[PDB]
Amino acid sequence: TQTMKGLDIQKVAGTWYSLAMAASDISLLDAQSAPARVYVEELKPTPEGDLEFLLQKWENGECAQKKIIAEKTKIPAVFKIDALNENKVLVLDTDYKKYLLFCWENSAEPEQSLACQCLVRTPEVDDEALEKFDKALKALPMHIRLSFNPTQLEEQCH
Amino acid sequence: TQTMKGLDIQKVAGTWYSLAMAASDISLLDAQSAPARVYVEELKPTPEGDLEFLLQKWENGECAQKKIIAEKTKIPAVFKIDALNENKVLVLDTDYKKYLLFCWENSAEPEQSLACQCLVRTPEVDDEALEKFDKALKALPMHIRLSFNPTQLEEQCH
Numbered sequence: 001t002q003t004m005k006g007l008d009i010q011k012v013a014g015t016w017y018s019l020a021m022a023a024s025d026i027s028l029l030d031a032q033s034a035p036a037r038v039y040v041e042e043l044k045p046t047p048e049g050d051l052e053f054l055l056q057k058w059e060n061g062e063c064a065q066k067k068i069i070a071e072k073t074k075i076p077a078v079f080k081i082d083a084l085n086e087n088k089v090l091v092l093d094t095d096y097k098k099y100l101l102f103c104w105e106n107s108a109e110p111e112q113s114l115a116c117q118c119l120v121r122t123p124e125v126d127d128e129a130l131e132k133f134d135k136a137l138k139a140l141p142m143h144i145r146l147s148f149n150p151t152q153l154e155e156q157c158h
Numbered sequence: 159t160q161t162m163k164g165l166d167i168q169k170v171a172g173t174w175y176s177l178a179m180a181a182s183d184i185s186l187l188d189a190q191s192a193p194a195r196v197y198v199e200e201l202k203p204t205p206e207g208d209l210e211f212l213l214q215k216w217e218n219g220e221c222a223q224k225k226i227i228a229e230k231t232k233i234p235a236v237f238k239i240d241a242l243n244e245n246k247v248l249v250l251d252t253d254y255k256k257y258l259l260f261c262w263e264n265s266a267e268p269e270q271s272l273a274c275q276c277l278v279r280t281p282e283v284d285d286e287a288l289e290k291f292d293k294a295l296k297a298l299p300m301h302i303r304l305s306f307n308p309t310q311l312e313e314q315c316h
């Protein structure tokens with residue numbers, strides 16, 4: 001995965017929408033309750049230089065809010081979630097004002113599990129951001145892709 | 159939808175595999191039991207010039223075989239399934255020996271519902287056929303895409 005050079009994490013703060021998503025395995029995104037079917041509501045960079053995600057996930061028949069802390073690492077644009085550092089967030093690219101591309105990656109199995117998203121600042125379709133997402137995906141072993149309409153962007157859990 | 163010119167339906171006979179699929183609506187393909195999650199096993203052109211699909215679909219916790227008859231119409235490469243002719247099969251392109259691209263289309267609602275597949279003759283990934291599928295999708299309002307690995311191509315219901 002080619003990660004963003006010169007990321008300024010403080011500039012990604014505030015509201016985002018999940019416009020599109022893709023994963024290595026159909027099972028990660030197939031169902032509305034699938035393990036990687038999460039929607040980014042907000043990014044909150046911390047004083048420590050960590051990244052807080054506010055997520056919505058469909059769980060047990062409702063839209064559940066979760067705050068996930070991705071801690072800074074010695075590799076820029078790469079953040080660790082778990083104590084083993086096997087669950088990471090990889091920031092691929094952003095222009096801070098319109099779009100952000102990132103992946104969750106799990107390195108616990110011999111086969112990499114990956115789910116990547118195209119985030120936008122406003123609940124609208126941006127073809128530019130979707131083309132940058134598709135280009136970033138070309139080198140990745142993706143088997144499922146989803147994209148949402150503006151109606152879905154403003155709905156709880158899309 | 160741009161349909162194939164000069165289709166020779168008799169040459170599509172025999173074994174096929176669903177390598178990739180895409181749909182207008184996430185709900186059509188999201189789940190393993192989703193309404194358009196069907197796998198093409200065989201095409202059987204009839205003496206009348208109709209097209210018989212042998213399909214596998216995951217239904218009520220098992221892999222169910224269905225024979226679906228798509229009848230010829232006065233428009234070449236377009237076949238009708240139902241008495242209202244609202245459910246059609248549209249053949250977009252084939253080289254008969256390697257790949258076939260087609261869509262199911264439902265015209266009963268004001269918004270078109272579409273699901274399109276990339277079929278291959280052998281249970282292997284063909285990047286050429288996937289690029290021809292992606293190019294055929296560019297003009298279509300697709301919001302979900304799935305692709306399968308060779309293991310999945312040889313498995314009942316993938």
Ligand SMILES: CNCCCN1c2ccccc2CCc2ccccc21
Nearest residue numbers: 035036038066068103104115116117
């Ligand atoms: C099997 N575990 C999947 C974890 C998926 N994950 C995702 C997925 C996409 C984008 C970000 C994240 C951040 C970590 C996280 C937190 C809570 C649920 C899922 C996820």
Ligand SMILES: CNCCCN1c2ccccc2CCc2ccccc21
Nearest residue numbers: 193194196224226261262273274275
């Ligand atoms: C809501 N109805 C969906 C019908 C989907 N359909 C598909 C889907 C993809 C490719 C071919 C077809 C042929 C018709 C058919 C027959 C049986 C189940 C689904 C489908």
Ligand SMILES: [Cl-]
Nearest residue numbers: 017018039040
């Ligand atoms: Cl979102």
Ligand SMILES: [Cl-]
Nearest residue numbers: 072073074075
């Ligand atoms: Cl580190």
Ligand SMILES: [Cl-]
Nearest residue numbers: 143144303305
């Ligand atoms: Cl895909």
Ligand SMILES: [Cl-]
Nearest residue numbers: 175176197198
């Ligand atoms: Cl198949």
Ligand SMILES: [Cl-]
Nearest residue numbers: 230231232233
């Ligand atoms: Cl007709």
Ligand SMILES: [Cl-]
Nearest residue numbers: 145147301302
């Ligand atoms: Cl998509």
